[PDB]
């Protein structure tokens with residue numbers, strides 16, 4: 001009996017088998033329907049977004065289209081992994097501070113629709129910490145929907161100190177679409193959103209000193225990069241390369257009054273007991289695709305240094321595989337017999353209903 | 363819940379050092395004659411049971427997990443999870459310490475230290 005591990009990201013499904021060192025199925029968490037008023041899922045919807053309008057059933061870590069999310073789960077089991085879900089205990093993941101109905105309904109569908117024999121819901125940032133080989137540290141996890149800071153001490157998240165920001169990769173893609181349109185291009189449609197997401201992933205970076213980089217960009221073309229669109233046109237991107245992820249540190253770039261990710265990290269540490277803060281500062285672990293920008297670790301090191309006491313030892317850990325750290329932490333934990341002992345069984349669900357998730361998970 | 367791990371049965375019952383190695387996700391005891399020798403390719407859990415200053419007839423606990431320079435991600439992650447489990451098994455009383463080869467704390471060094479080449483194979487299946 002092999003367990004399944006499914007990390008349902010706002011942007012990407014990462015799924016596979018406990019004990020594997022990587023997810024065997026990674027595909028867009030999207031459902032596509034004809035743009036001209038049937039449905040397609042995942043890579044295939046992405047492949048012919050030319051005639052589809054694409055919709056994400058998860059927004060900011062929360063399932064907002066339960067009918068389409070069921071389609072995504074069905075596709076993951078039957079079409080990608082090609083397994084029978086009733087035969088596999090399944091580990092799911094969630095961002096912290098979600099509305100409680102989200103994981104209640106995840107539990108209901110898994111047992112009532114897919115008839116899994118057992119399941120469990122784990123906090124994403126905690127899985128990433130264990131994947132880094134730590135029990136104490138503070139995780140910054142940023143995917144396509146949510147950025148969250150979770151400080152963890154002796155293996156347990158500290159919920160009073162968790163910080164959450166509904167600003168992540170999709171907001172950055174949207175912002176690149178906006179500022180590229182201001183350069184003379186026009187990126188508006190859901191298909192064009194996917195083009196700009198690819199530009200973002202290939203060409204953006206976090207400037208170490210934003211004002212200096214802005215001046216470098218005006219002084220010459222040294223920072224400019226070219227990009228070939230699907231139709232063959234070649235565009236040029238300049239200071240948009242680093243203005244787009246600058247939004248993580250300056251959320252006002254998209255009209256948000258929130259603290260930037262350096263400040264939320266600092267605020268999260270300051271919510272923790274004084275005597276553990278040095279260990280948190282020395283163990284800042286980044287996970288998720290929106291932590292993949294070149295330059296982000298160095299920028300975080302600089303910004304936290306400016307916020308922290310002058311002698312504080314600060315370290316950013318940026319695992320090269322951190323687009324998959326949540327999944328890998330799940331694959332490790334689901335390979336342990338005692339972790340699976342804690343899972344919700346179908347029988348327990350039958351007797352207790354969706355509330356069972358709060359007794360056995362959170 | 364930690365009661366389902368055979369490795370913890372009888373752990374921490376007297377003053378001394380107990381050591382387990384992670385082997386393909388399992389917690390495997392290290393025989394006493396090898397305590398202090400660590401494979402650079404592996405990850406370990408070290409439970410130090412001692413008498414606290416407050417009462418010479420009672421027991422307190424430091425739990426160290428030791429990560430070899432060449433240990434694989436599955437081994438380090440299992441060592442972390444199972445350290446938390448052993449901590450819970452002992453009622454939360456153990457204080458946890460993460461020890462990386464070449465960076466071991468003064469506390470860890472004081473328990474003994476020989477580093478051995480190689481180690482046991484990863485528990486991961488490699489996805490091509």
Ligand SMILES: C=C1[C@@H](C)[C@H]2[C@H](Cc3ccccc3)NC(=O)[C@]23[C@H](OC(C)=O)/C=C/[C@@](C)(O)C(=O)[C@@H](C)C/C=C/[C@H]3[C@@H]1O
Nearest residue numbers: 121122123126127155156157158159360361362443446447
């Ligand atoms: C991976 C997760 C679980 C395995 C728990 C894990 C500790 C643990 C380790 C080994 C054996 C048992 C427990 N670390 C956590 O933060 C968890 C752990 O969950 C449980 C039930 O132990 C933490 C619970 C709290 C209350 O501290 C929370 O923060 C709670 C709101 C969110 C749940 C977090 C859990 C996380 O999803």
Ligand SMILES: Nc1ncnc2c1ncn2[C@@H]1O[C@H](COP(=O)(O)OP(=O)(O)O)[C@@H](O)[C@H]1O
Nearest residue numbers: 009010011012143144169201288289290292293
């Ligand atoms: N190299 C990169 N640079 C910047 N952003 C990236 C990079 N790679 C992926 N991303 C972004 O990360 C997000 C997907 O990461 P992931 O951790 O899978 O998110 P989720 O778990 O929410 O699906 C998307 O916004 C994607 O554009």
Ligand SMILES: [Ca+2]
Nearest residue numbers: 403404481482
């Ligand atoms: Ca090994």
Ligand SMILES: [Ca+2]
Nearest residue numbers: 449454455456
């Ligand atoms: Ca403890």
Ligand SMILES: [Mg+2]
Nearest residue numbers: 009010143288
């Ligand atoms: Mg994610």
